[PDB]
Structures are given as structure tokens and as C-alpha cells.
């Protein structure tokens with residue numbers, strides 16, 4: 001009952017519901033002290049915890065966004081111009097949109113710090129992970145559900161902590177693959 | 178009542194008290210001799226074993242905070258001076274955990290033994306938590322009935338502000 | 349036949365008298381004997397806890413072998429079994445001397461490495477004779493199961509302790525000489 005209530009506010013796609021509905025039936029027919037019951041409980045907890053159809057309220061005002069960006073950092077006019085253009089595009093579309101941007105430059109210049117300022121100007125949620133010399137693909141997408149003590153991917157773990165489907169994702173050292 | 182007499186000796190949060198209160202209610206109806214009739218006592222005993230509101234005075238002074246270091250270890254003048262810098266900023270900030278401290282150097286130089294000296298410097302409770310291999314559900318995640326090592330750390334130190342040293346994080 | 353619980357409880361207490369049972373171990377034995385009486389004779393849980401009682405009592409608690417703390421006698425045993433190996437023999441003799449001055453038995457971690465066929469596995473049995481310690485051998489070569497050392501949880505059907513625990517029951521003393529063979533091939 002509690003997990004059904006926690007899905008009420010979210011806007012769940014149809015393919016999400018059938019997976020959730022079928023696992024609920026499996027959870028019902030299991031036993032309390034079953035090892036796979038905990039696995040089913042752990043898996044079902046993650047599905048409901050992930051936000052579905054929940055987007056954070058964006059900030060779509062150029063005046064306040066530009067003022068916020070100026071106070072946080074000095075210079076970076078090329079980055080600031082792109083962010084101001086990003087907000088203007090969202091106004092014409094009438095709906096939130098996403099983009100893939102790259103900040104390259106000398107270390108310690110402000111590439112990581114400016115993105116944190118970007119999130120607050122856009123009222124988004126900030127999450128950071130690094131890929132410097134990645135070795136395991138399991139970091140991005142987690143482990144399979146059958147594995148004992150498995151966990152979802154870091155991106156999936158981001159939606160749980162951010163509690164929204166519109167976060168700001170930062171990637172570090174794409175030139176140090 | 179023996180569990181309750183220990184419970185009333187220390188401050189108990191209201192949120193945890195309701196969970197503790199219901200555990201006694203179930204345990205009274207149980208026969209205390211079964212797989213589930215014994216885990217409730219284990220669950221309850223681990224609850225009352227955890228300290229709440231009990232702590233040791235921190236940051237006693239700065240003059241004799243140094244005095245612990247010199248008689249515990251020789252040399253490491255730069256390392257010792259850095260710790261006093263961390264202790265000084267901690268007192269001004271009024272917060273125990275400001276940032277994570279790590280020590281890197283050649284093996285067998287004395288990094289592990291420093292932490293024991295640090296705990297005596299500002300009157301903490303030392304606890305070493307070293308890891309050799311990386312496994313998910315082995316050391317923190319616990320089970321379910323094996324409580325996590327962090328929970329066991331507070332019980333054996335009987336304080337709300339212990340000192341936990343993580344050793345060999347790279348390995 | 350008489351009452352099964354009374355005979356089972358009394359016979360298990362007989363084994364505990366000779367041992368030096370730790371307080372926490374004694375409490376665990378006492379609490380499980382309390383639930384043994386209330387359980388039925390043919391109940392499955394009765395048989396599960398009965399084996400748990402047997403394993404706990406079988407462990408030698410506070411029992412140590414009468415080690416041979418005689419440097420002259422220890423040398424005689426070592427030289428007759430093997431030739432040479434002065435570095436190993438001298439280390440063993442120095443281990444005996446330290447135990448004398450400390451006044452109590454002690455345990456050490458030793459590793460012998462070298463080319464095959466130089467006497468590493470065969471000197472281990474000779475050392476046990478010199479030290480008058482019971483000898484147990486267990487090789488870890490090609491070992492992929494952790495339950496061999498740590499056993500299985502009592503809830504599992506057919507679950508058994510690790511052979512280190514089975515080492516103590518067979519050795520019957522808390523001071524064996526366990527030879528962990530082929531550690532480099534784990």
C-alpha cells in the first residue's frame with residue numbers, strides 16, 4: 001500500500017506501471033524471510049523512488065539569470081553568452097529543453113565551478129560524476145538485477161537524490177578517457 | 178524494565194522512541210525462543226546499545242593538544258603543525274567535521290599511528306576501519322542479521338562523537 | 349529410555365566442565381539449552397539446535413597442548429627429520445626461547461618460500477613434533493569457496509562450520525599448528 005501511494009504523484013509511463021504491477025504480484029506471493037523478497041523489495045523501492053514526469057521549475061528570466069551568473073564568477077563571457085542564449089531558446093519553445101555543452105580549458109580556471117553557478121541560475125539540481133580514466137562500464141548503468149547486492153547506475157542514482165527528471169549533469173575529464 | 182532503565186539513563190529521540198516502544202510491545206507477546214523471537218531482542222538490544230546524547234568533551238585546549246603529539250611521535254613537524262591548523266579552524270568554526278583529512282606517504286611511516294595520537298589530543302574515541310578488498314555488501318551495507326560496522330563503532334565507544342579512521346582507501 | 353532433554357542437557361554440561369568456557373559463550377549455550385527443552389522431540393528445529401550444541405561443546409575452550417619448551421630436545425627432533433635448513437631451524441629454536449622468557453605460549457605467522465622440493469611442506473610436520481603441538485594441514489591451492497573457511501549459516505539445511513573450526517574439534521586443543529599450503533595459489 002505504501003509503495004502504491006508513493007507513485008500517485010508521479011507521471012509514470014505505461015511500460016513503468018506493468019513492470020511495477022508485475023513485481024507487486026511477485027512480492028505478494030513471496031515470503032517475508034525470503035532472500036529474493038528483499039531483492040524484489042529493493043528493486044521495487046528504486047523504481048518508485050525514481051521520479052516519473054516530475055520536472056523542476058526552471059528559471060526563464062534573462063535579467064535575474066544574468067545577474068546571478070555575474071555575481072558567482074568573473075569573466076567567462078563565452079560561457080555566459082551561451083547560457084543566456086539557452087534560456088531564450090526555451091522561451092520560444094515554451095517547454096524545457098536539454099543541450100550537450102563542453103567546457104575545455106586549462107585546469108583550475110573555473111570549468112567545474114561555473115556549472116554549479118549555472119544550476120542555481122536555472123533553478124536546476126546539480127549532480128557531478130567524473131570519468132577520468134574510466135575502466136568499468138558498470139558505473140554508468142549499474143549491475144544486473146539478478147546479481148546479489150546490485151545497484152543501479154550513477155545516472156539512475158542521480159534521479160533518486162535529485163528527485164526530479166530535469167537535473168544538471170556534469171562530466172569531468174572527457175579528454176582523460 | 179532493565180532495557181527501559183538503561184533507556185531512561187540517556188536522551189532518546191522521539192522518532193526512535195516510537196520504534197523502540199513498539200519493539201517492546203511485540204517482544205512481550207513473543208516467546209523469545211525462535212528465529213523471529215530472538216531477533217527482536219537482538220534488534221532491541223542493538224538499539225539500546227547505541228549511544229544517544231552521550232559524548233566526550235571535544236577540543237579541551239591548544240596548549241596540551243600539542244603535548245600529546247610530541248610524546249606520542251617524533252619528528253613530523255610539518256604534519257604536527259598542520260593538525261594544529263586543523264584543530265584551530267575547527268574550534269573557530271564550531272563544527273566537528275569541516276572537511277575530510279587524509280594522509281599519503283611511503284608505507285610504514287606512521288600515518289596509522291597518528292590517528293590514535295589525534296584522538297587523545299582532542300579527547301575522542303579512536304576506531305580503525307581498514308579495508309583490503311572492495312566489496313559492496315561486505316563492510317558498510319551489512320545484512321537485512323549483521324549490523325553495519327559504523328553502528329557497531331558507536332556502541333563500543335559509548336559516545337556520539339567518536340573518531341573513525343579509514344585506512345588504505347586506495348587498496 | 350529416559351527423558352531425552354535431561355540426558356541431552358546433562359551430557360552437554362559434562363563436556364563443558366573440563367573446558368574454560370568464556371562468559372559470552374556460556375550465555376549462548378545456556379540460552380539455547382532453554383529453548384531446547386521447550387521444543388518437541390521430533391521437531392526439525394530440535395535437531396538443528398542439537399547439532400549447534402554439539403559443535404559448541406566440542407570446541408576446546410581454554411585448552412592448550414603441553415608444548416616441549418626444551419631447546420636441547422627440540423634440536424634433536426629437528427635434525428633427525430631433515431638435513432640442513434639452518435635458517436628455518438634457527439627461527440624455530442628462537443621461537444621456543446621467546447616463549448620461555450615470555451613465560452606463556454604464543455602464536456606466530458611464518459611463511460616458507462623457495463623452489464619446489466626443498467622441504468617446506470615436510471618440515472611443518474617435523475616442527476610440530478619438536479614443539480609438541482598437534483599438526484593440521486590445509487591447502488588453499490585452487491580454492492574458490494569462502495564457506496570452506498567460514499562455514500554456512502545454521503539456518504541452511506546441511507550447513508556446517510568451516511574446517512578451521514573442524515580443525516579445533518579434531519585437534520582438541522586451542523594451540524594447533526595449522527599449515528596453510530600453497531598460499532600463493534589462492
Ligand SMILES: Nc1ncnc2c1ncn2[C@@H]1O[C@H](COP(=O)(O)OP(=O)(O)OP(=O)(O)O)[C@@H](O)[C@H]1O
Pocket residue numbers: 249250251252253283284285286287288289290291345
Ligand atoms: N614519527 C614516529 N614517532 C614514533 N613512532 C613512530 C613514528 N613513525 C612510525 N612510528 C612507529 O612505527 C609504527 C608503524 O607505523 P604505522 O603502522 O602507523 O604505519 P602506516 O603508515 O599506517 O602503514 P601502512 O602503509 O602499512 O598502512 C607505528 O605504529 C609507530 O609505533
Ligand SMILES: Nc1ncnc2c1ncn2[C@@H]1O[C@H](COP(=O)(O)OP(=O)(O)OP(=O)(O)O)[C@@H](O)[C@H]1O
Pocket residue numbers: 429430431432433462463464465466467468469470471
Ligand atoms: N633437507 C631435507 N632433508 C630430508 N628430506 C628432505 C629435505 N628437503 C626435502 N626433503 C624431502 O624431499 C621431499 C620434498 O617435498 P616437500 O613437500 O618437502 O617440498 P616442498 O618444498 O614443499 O615443495 P613444493 O613447493 O612443490 O610444495 C620430501 O620427501 C621431503 O621430506
Ligand SMILES: Nc1ncnc2c1ncn2[C@@H]1O[C@H](COP(=O)(O)OP(=O)(O)O)[C@@H](O)[C@H]1O
Pocket residue numbers: 072073074075076106107108109110111112113114
Ligand atoms: N572567474 C572565477 N570567479 C570565481 N571563482 C573562480 C573563478 N575562476 C576560478 N574560480 C575558483 O577556482 C576554483 C577552480 O577549480 P575548478 O574550476 O573546479 O577546477 P577545474 O577548472 O580543473 O574544474 C573554483 O573553486 C572557483 O571557486
Ligand SMILES: [Mg+2]
Pocket residue numbers: 288289344
Ligand atoms: Mg596502516
Ligand SMILES: [Mg+2]
Pocket residue numbers: 468469470
Ligand atoms: Mg610443498
